[model samples]
Target: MKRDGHTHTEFCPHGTHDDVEEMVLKAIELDFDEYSIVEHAPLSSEFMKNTAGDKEAVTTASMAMSDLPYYFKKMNHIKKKYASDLLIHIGFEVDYLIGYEDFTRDFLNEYGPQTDDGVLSLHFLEGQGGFRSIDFSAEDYNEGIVQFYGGFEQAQLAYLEGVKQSIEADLGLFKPRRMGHISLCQKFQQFFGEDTSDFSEEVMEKFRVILALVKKRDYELDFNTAGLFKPLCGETYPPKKIVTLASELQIPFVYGSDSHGVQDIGRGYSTYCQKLE
Candidate 1:
């Protein structure tokens, strides 16, 4: 059984305006049996209050609160329409904003029952001014996270700390089963000529801590393949060694295309097969 567990949709403020139905058809064509339209969920007003830098980027990072009803309606309709061909799970790619635990938990409690599958993810780190959006751009990352943390490795550690906190946080009973892209800090590694610092020993140690928490919590890994398509990131979210270790720990890996457009429905799927098949 094949599944795309962390996909986005047209409702995504930063995504291509591809028809959601068309993307579903594309996944079916690729022979996927299950797919989730986990659109980028609304960022809390609290997030707005703490976020700094690239106001435009942060402002357009997720769908608005008012769109939630339409998103759920459209996805539920699609799920019923193609039930015979594929198992479609309607959900959200819920962000784990630091210091907004209650806000996130409240969101999950209200909407989690509607989703049987989804991803819980962290995309920001404590950086300059306050919380900075880490995945928006290399310059933004470098200035906000890297500079504030004093180095790329330090930023990675800080990022992982946030990830671990999410794993440990109480996001209600209906939280996303998979942890989304645990190593998103690599999104711009190559752009800054930082070759993952060969994934330094300290980083590996941090990953071990993260993997332990994931297994302890019975959470799955997103095994996100979107990173391979990134110009600056030439590997998966957690990279190779991390994947290998997670495999050793027997953690369940859920392949997530993290697709934002129809053409991206199964991007880098072959690579996933090579690594996990």
Candidate 2:
């Protein structure tokens, strides 16, 4: 009754405050018998593209990509340390890059067979980092919003593209052990209400088209609770539409706190594990 398939450690720069031990300790406190740590491990090429060194930023994310082995080692060490307290599963929430099959395979295989599993997620669309940012300020959120419903449409489009590419990439990789968060787009829509041109039939048609593609994918769409805790996404991750699509697809959803620190580990997991048992 106490198993969480999706959880995160402090390795991801965006995580608030979490080390591997902190996460495991929290899980044990919650009386959980097993927990999974899905840390970030983007391919080297994609890492360089998204994290373009600014030099001004203190932490060089580019270098962090190369530290995957170390992250794995740390998790493995903690896994044994807390063996009696709780079971620890080490895996990576790998961000799949479009048109880079060889690179994705190479990057994933580097984890070695000893790793628990690999979850393929798509966070990039267009090219490397091709999503547009929207200002949630009152000026834009209110009636003053011009062109494209607070620009949410553009963002959703980018997310859909990312999901589509993720599906193709996973298939290309011959179906990895697990699939990453598939409910990412709808999660965005829920957090940020995208204005739809009710009068414009074309917009509605496009919306349905995208939804269709989402349900078509054959993989588990992780209902990452981490989004609810993390500000990684302006709105809650896996907005309502994404959740609905996942349910419709009958995709088995997994829970992850996306923990960067120990305190957030296994947070709100009570409801997540209910479905498993």
Top candidate on lDDT is 1
TM-score of 1: 0.97
- Give the least accurate 10-residue stretch of model 1, judged by summed lDDT: 191-200
For model 1, how does the per-residue alpha-carbon lDDT over 23-86 read when each residue is reduced to its tens digit? Answer: 9999999999999888888998977888787887688889888998998999999999999999
Models, CA RMSD each: 1.1, 5.7
| Candidate 1 lDDT score at position 267 | 90
TM-score of each: 0.97, 0.70
Relative to the true structure, candidate 2 reaches a TM of 0.70
Poorest stretch of ten by lDDT in candidate 2: 127-136
* Whole-model lDDT per candidate: 0.87, 0.55
